[PDB]
Design a protein around this ligand. Sequence first.
Ligand SMILES: [Mn+2]
Ligand SMILES: [Mn+2]
Ligand SMILES: [Mn+2]
Ligand SMILES: [Mn+2]
Ligand SMILES: [Mn+2]
Length: 391
Amino acid sequence: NKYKRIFLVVMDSVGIGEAPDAEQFGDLGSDTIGHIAEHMNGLQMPNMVKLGLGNIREMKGISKVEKPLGYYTKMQEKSTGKDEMTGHWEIMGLYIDTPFQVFPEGFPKELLDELEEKTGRKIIGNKPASGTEILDELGQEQMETGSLIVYTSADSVLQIAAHEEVVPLDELYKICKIARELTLDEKYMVGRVIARPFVGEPGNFTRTPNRHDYALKPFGRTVMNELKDSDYDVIAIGKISDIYDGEGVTESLRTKSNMDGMDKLVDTLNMDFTGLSFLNLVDFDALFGHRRDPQGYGEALQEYDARLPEVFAKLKEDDLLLITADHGNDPIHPGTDHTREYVPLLAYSPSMKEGGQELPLRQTFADIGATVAENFGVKMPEYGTSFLNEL
Ligand SMILES: [Mn+2]
Ligand SMILES: [Mn+2]
Ligand SMILES: [Mn+2]
Ligand SMILES: [Mn+2]
Ligand SMILES: [Mn+2]
């Protein structure tokens, strides 16, 4: 192998400006890093700058450097959709024609009618809401009636809440499996069904850790599958295992925050492994992008950047660091959905004694998968062109 270890970091939703096909999505004018930089009167990201972030694109507080530590470019999404699954699945070598849908006005009556028909239960709610909000509003009615609270987030999810003392957990799980079956339909294609059991009394409801998820497997065997099948380590950090439904994962490390994510990345740097360490930093998307909070997003990016020098110090000559994103989620954009954007790509190894250069623009996210596959000598993905030789 050229590199013994590849550390892949997805800064979730950290887009670098509208893609050529942004108009189709209602995403004209969308710039995630750029609008955040303007809100902050200049972003403080000196370590990303040293890597060459400004060399990809100059933004307020983010300037180009004469000698970037590593190679740099941006990537264009080839798949139809801009959702959580699509971006990650493409990164690992796939092409996804069928997008996962979001439901800002709730689910179609046709879907909910069939769920009622199959379960013999009434459905209430049917709106985007946080767990706390929907239980405060509907928890009591749910307890008294034995109905199901169905709700969604700003991402492609269908969540079903029921009180543990009113609907047995095993019955809730059975209902979620039915919902999972009904939502494998492009009429209303849902990424994830989530059981949301709760306990307590009116005015004091709490969700329990008895949450179960019902996810879809990637539409194809991924580069992670190939690595695992060839006895390489595939260490998933954060939501990565969930996103791929465990496919090709050899170890999964749960994280509770972006800072915790970086701690787990550092943990993997300290591990003797051969293969891929794959981190998703989700706070950018989950806390700040969807909530249209440019201040919080900017603070999070600055907190993330400050962690990087320790990562640089720990990288070995035969380690490669790859930093990218999955889509955009511009915190100063209408609505609550993602934005169709280019994503940055930074590729750094301490063995790059002369620093890096500009790479040709990556025409699909699958170029990452192709590079990883070529490095470890496993079956190449159907899509994607490796840039390993350029490094
Ligand atoms: Mn838009
Ligand atoms: Mn994402
Ligand atoms: Mn999202
Ligand atoms: Mn050196
Ligand atoms: Mn390309």
